[PDB]
Amino acid sequence: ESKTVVVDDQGKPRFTSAKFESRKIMVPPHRMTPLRNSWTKIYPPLVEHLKLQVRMNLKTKSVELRTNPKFTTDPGALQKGADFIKAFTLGFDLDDSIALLRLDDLYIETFEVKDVKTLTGDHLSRAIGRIAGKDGKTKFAIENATRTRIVLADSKIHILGGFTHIRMARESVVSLILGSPPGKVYGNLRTVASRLKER
């Protein structure tokens, strides 16, 4: 640009006109085994629709995601991919973690049986069998009702979905932990599913 002033009328001058960001996420080996098993379908939703550089240090058991400034100008995408890998590593399935990528209002809540009501040993065992139900039937009922997804660890219980959805699922599973019979659980279940289907 050359430099020269143009003096307009009333003496007025006249001119003429003239960063990566990364995140790291660990993975446990029991979760790394299906990660290695189904790694192939993990990156195609993100590297193509979010344009996020991926690396995975099996030396460090972690995954790295880098936003390039010219290739990507999208603020929440690295964060969304972080939520995606967090959900999967927490134990949720690939399609529901992708569902979390599709939406932005999908939220996770985890909690513990000792946080709600501490129980011991075989009491905890019978309680886990109760909250599971016969062959996860009750868990499926909860998931279908609240439209939520549940992950049942030893004590960590993870619930993915909408805010009030996981709220309702939390109230239900708190009832199960405290000792609710599954029939009255089913009664309240079709009640809450009735109002949620009516809305």
Partner: peptide
């Protein structure tokens, strides 16, 4: 069975 990922940076920018 060549896996971008574990090896080096697998991204849209470069490799």
């Amino acid at each position: 069975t060549t896996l971008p990922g574990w090896g080096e940076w697998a991204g849209a920018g470069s490799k």
